[model samples]
Target: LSLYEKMLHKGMIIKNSNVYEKIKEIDTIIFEKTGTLTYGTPIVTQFIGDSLSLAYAASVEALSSHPIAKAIVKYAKEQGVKILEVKDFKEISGIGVRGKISDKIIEVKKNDIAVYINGEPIASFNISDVPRPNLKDYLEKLKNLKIIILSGDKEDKVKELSKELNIQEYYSNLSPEDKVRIIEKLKQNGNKVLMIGDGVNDAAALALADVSVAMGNVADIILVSNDIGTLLGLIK
Candidate 1:
């Protein structure tokens, strides 16, 4: 409420639950990056061999623009690794990257995801929220519908996850208009659309979609909750 008041008072549509349910009549759904999907906690999943030491692993991967890469690099720095300048930071979208660290060609690939060292991946004793609860199940339900994972995450990571989840359609590296484009396309096709998200970044698509959802914690959207559940219990 208060959050809604602040935004609504500012002239935002900020629809109510009933209105939201009515809004869900639309078909396509687009989720925001960091939240509602990937737990926003990125990590050093793959570090190649010879690159084992905290210094090398952190130093090399830190050069990446990937959020996961950023998280891993930050963690490495906290572990006391001093990263120097990175050279030839070639980004291989939708897969991984190949970069030059001290004249060595080190590539970081996603292998069930445990950072490796020099092609020899490194295993994490600790884990973070990479996958959300009921993610696959929700995706499965969307099989007959226009299911697409709309995310601002890199095209490679989103596409890879889309493939892993066996979700045939997805749009990665999306922008606000990119999201809007999806909603418009679906509406034009005579399909009811629903946008499930809990971020300010999702506002445009949420506004564009027939229906929008916000987590109870998402005061900006001013809703109680948006997670859907059946009698079968939690879907993960």
Candidate 2:
């Protein structure tokens, strides 16, 4: 069987046969923070405000598919807060969401990690994300390759994870376009980059990579298995 056929048998979804050739030439691996490194399912660890504030935040967040939004909505539901109807809901990519409920403007922005009601802070959510299982082992197996993390998340959080993984190269608080530029420069410098990600924010960078793998179901090259070690088999 061909390499493409072998990868298919291993449950990797590849759109083009040329990806098999690209896989062997990858010199750098760029990982998108949230969904790629972590489980992408964050939990609301602390909610410091009244139920009314949470209701407003959750209502606005309910319209978004982002992991953080999902966590807030789930937390609100567990507390029995109603998810109200939001009018003119807007999701600012890499930022947050906002809308009007009962004619009161509500926003859940990343800045200060709080909920805003009519331009005033009402409640704040503290979220916690756990790294995927066997992440260290996967990284160790790919140690010879240059691994870097590019994320839209906060610096401290990204730094902590990078340190834990013992990966020296990391960039945080980057937009989708910023990620694209980084990969473009890497390619210009003659490095074959492989981007692994699972978010709408990751789309542009994923498209720019020499080879890209979507951890979730969004991209042309989708990773069917949760085991990142599947990448090792592909490389070999």
Candidate 3:
């Protein structure tokens, strides 16, 4: 109760009180890419193809709640491109979002980093994300635990981030189901896993972990505060 009170005071909400007990048993810590490690807000660095392509991509992406999608939409808006009306909008988990705009099918997929119109590739975007401040310091302090990065992002992007953090173990290009499987395998091997994430994609794995923490203002055990230091304080 004392620990829980302390955590609550620090803006960490423990939905299930039992999570306090589970935290003590955690040996493996799995982190999500976008919101958890990096500041979730990415900026569109460059666009390839044409202005019309950007308009189409932004029109399709504007419907999505994903951080990357918002970035594209923001970039397009800044460039004076109007967002078009979309129909049949669909968000494919871990893949991308698609919709019909102006009688053409538009898709903004991650791995391809491109916009596809009517099954044909049209434009590509380069987005840059910044890591959380002092993230490495917190990770370094938790050297006693096995830290792993699991993300739905492209292999190269995930690898680059993992290398920057000096974390050896990472798995990229995964779906939500894939993340759940990894957590299950870790548990089967007698590893007590602590999953930390901040996305809809992380929901399944978060539920399966020994102790789960939602990075910011969402989920069961949520860190209402944005700093990674709050997490380190809890574990310590």
Candidate 4:
């Protein structure tokens, strides 16, 4: 009876008695990192010593589709910065991009600076992460639930953040297949999984998940994403 009440409260219309019963049994939570958990903000900073830089990194990353790429490009855009076209745009899987930015060939790799100019390296930019509001509170709520950080970002960044956020289990440095593998593992254990993503590459995993959500800005085909977007949130 309590279980039935919980279901009622949750606003779930039971289409199948068996499935409904299964759903009301226990608690299961899976949180995906990235635009979901984080505020999705990545600020620009130039690293000359060991920290990442802005100008040099941005110039090299303009050809990539990675989140950092968007962040760098966005930061440039905000500053009215314009990037030149590269002759060859190379996306090294599990790595950053490399291309020619206006007759200058540069490589935007992970966590290293000293971009050479005429065989001499100079400059670095440090990016500020954009974490969401109420993250710590929300994290505390799902204390007993599984907390996982699945990211394409470098392991160091992921590991660094785990300590920052006090998160225990994380799966960083992952790819599209890696994400799919995770979903498969959870499902095999008889868990009804959910994949909430903002990338088109997530389509494969989303199709397999019980429920999937894509961001409003997602260029991918998802079961549910952003639909009715108001003016910030103006009352109709």
Q: What does the lDDT come to for candidate 2?
A: 0.82
**Model 3: residue 22 alpha-carbon error in angstroms:** 3.2
Model 3: per-residue Cα lDDT at residue 193: 88
TM-score, candidate number 2: 0.82
Model 4 lDDT, residue 120, Cα:
40
Model 4 residue 87 distance off true place after TM-score fit, in angstroms: 7.4
Candidate 1 TM-score, true structure as reference: 0.52
- Better candidate number, 3 or 4, judged by TM-score: 3
Instruction: Please write out the lDDT profile of model 4 over residues 128-234, one tens digit for every residue.
Output: 55554443443553553454567766787777777676677778778878888887888888876544565455556655665454544421122122321110011
Clashes of each: 28, 0, 0, 17
Name the top TM-score candidate: 2
| Cα lDDT computed for each candidate against the true fold | 0.56, 0.82, 0.83, 0.53
- How many Å off is the CA of 176 in candidate 4? 1.7
CA displacement after TM-score superposition, residue 145 of candidate 1 (Å): 3.1
How would the candidate models be sorted by lDDT, starting from the highest?
Answer: 3, 2, 1, 4
Using all chains and alpha carbons, the TM-scores for the candidates as numbered come to 0.52, 0.82, 0.81, 0.59
